[PDB]
Ligand binder design. Sequence first.
Ligand code: 7YI
Ligand code: 7YI
Lengths: 306, 306
Amino acid sequence: SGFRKMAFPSGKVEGCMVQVTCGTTTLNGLWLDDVVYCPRHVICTSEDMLNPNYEDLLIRKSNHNFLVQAGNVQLRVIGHSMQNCVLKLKVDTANPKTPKYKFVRIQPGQTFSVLACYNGSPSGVYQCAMRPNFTIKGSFLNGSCGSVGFNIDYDCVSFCYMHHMELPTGVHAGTDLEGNFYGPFVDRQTAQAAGTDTTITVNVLAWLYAAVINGDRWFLNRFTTTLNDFNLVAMKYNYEPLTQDHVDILGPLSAQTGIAVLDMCASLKELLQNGMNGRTILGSALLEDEFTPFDVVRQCSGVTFQ
Amino acid sequence: SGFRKMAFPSGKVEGCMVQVTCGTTTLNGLWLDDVVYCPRHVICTSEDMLNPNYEDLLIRKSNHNFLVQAGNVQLRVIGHSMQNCVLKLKVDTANPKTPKYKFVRIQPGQTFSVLACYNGSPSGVYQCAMRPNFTIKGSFLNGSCGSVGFNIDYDCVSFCYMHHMELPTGVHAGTDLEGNFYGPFVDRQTAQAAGTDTTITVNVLAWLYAAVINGDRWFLNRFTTTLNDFNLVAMKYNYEPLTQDHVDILGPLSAQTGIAVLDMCASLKELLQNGMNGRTILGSALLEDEFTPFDVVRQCSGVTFQ
Ligand SMILES: *[C@H](O)[C@H](C[C@@H]1CCNC1=O)NC(=O)[C@H](CC1CC1)NC(=O)[C@@H](NC(=O)OCc1ccccc1)C1CC1
Ligand SMILES: *[C@H](O)[C@H](C[C@@H]1CCNC1=O)NC(=O)[C@H](CC1CC1)NC(=O)[C@@H](NC(=O)OCc1ccccc1)C1CC1
């Protein structure tokens, strides 16, 4: 019993983190096989931030401009290319700690662990989610760029996120490992806005099931509802529409608890309508939307990895 | 910026987790040098669980009764002994991935990362605190016993917690690595209760400082108070007393924000007397007490470890 915001164990990712320095810019890189991936804005200067032609700046550069510390063993760069917003540094040493891995591009609503790093060294690990407006609510300081987000499926690390930038609401934006931003953002210090976020309804329902599995039942009711009538209330409260696809992912959790999905929808509806009136659910006084249905099953069945 | 419950990177601990089986009991062990530490109730049967004399049971045992598996590698047990509520299994192979480590016993209100494990394999990592009633609010299922809690000290793992039991309430209880329970609990399935908990006042205050450092100031005020009159209010709302030592640990955060500790205390008092009135702080609608002052500084200055 118990339910926590739980990250994947970070060991397999820690053994890939390196430091990349070019000019007076230091950030993090990801070293897989003989390749080091990092944000291309490592090749900028502090005045270049306003409107760089990264294509300008890369041909400017020679392999020897790139300093690639793995620990205090310095890695010789022997080639470089740019893929969208990531820079790929070919080095003369394959990473012996390379895990088995994939590059995946995730969908809004999905979650992943972030291993926050500075100067190639890990600082901490936390979950978060790709928000519907394609930002993430992370914890990043100067120097964190190149930190990555990932999921583990038994032995395989699926990398989904590399950090690039903080927007002026304190939320963060970045790319997949092929260098394409999530959302409309660009690696440029000109005014950009996140866009209004919304709540991940299917995740909120999964968390309500986590609650029931762990003994919070004070929010349930006999009420039932239809997908469409529930969806009328979702609009009103800035909640993502629920699809039949979503209902179907929630089946397993529905069956384990014996609570129909639309009955849980009726519970959520009364929760938005009436608020919580002092009570908490799983230690929270807000409805939590950063656990997927898989995160809930993962944790409430103790799935492991190696 | 941003603020999350961030765990320590778990790599150094993952390389010490092993599986310990004896009879029909499998749980986790911690393998450091040539010693495997695990809960002594691995030697019990599903009927010993009631009121065992572990001395009874351990004399009954032979080295070959313990199956200790490090991945798929059979570790041979060559010696055993019991220290309070932990078993120490002497094995013929020293763990080549043993880190710099210490065994520490923490105080209530201190935090640590937990690496939850099943069958010797990591399942996830999360942060929590030693509650004032010496329980932890964890996430643990059957088979998780022997999972450990730890802090990192640049390069040194300080182990503080090993998991043993879940109380009714769904909170958890365990030992330090020398086998002494936190709190008055015992490793037998006789009726036991946690004891009323209280809020870690010093931790709520540094979390309010984390909020200010990150741009939530809606709760701040003109007012100040005396440590004596604040503590009159902390009593009324089931908060731990604030000591002058606590005021002193909050100095650094106080100086960075320029808000006196006693000004922040006046702010918390109005929060307690009025509530939050629909507003959130750092994404929470409750006052959060599982960040220490050190947790806030490391995160809001990006301390790294190796
Ligand atoms: C990389 O280490 C770093 C991480 C940032 C720094 C602080 N928190 C983080 O997550 N990223 C950057 O410094 C990038 C570099 C730019 C991408 C090439 N910049 C930013 O994160 C800046 N944000 C920004 O310019 O947003 C656009 C904007 C929005 C409003 C008004 C003007 C511009 C943050 C320093 C501001
Ligand atoms: C070890 O893997 C396991 C972990 C537990 C099981 C589920 N959640 C967990 O964290 N620990 C146990 O099974 C231990 C074994 C006891 C230490 C020798 N027991 C418990 O966790 C049980 N709790 C318990 O006996 O508490 C005392 C009590 C309280 C009320 C009434 C009677 C007894 C939980 C299985 C019940």
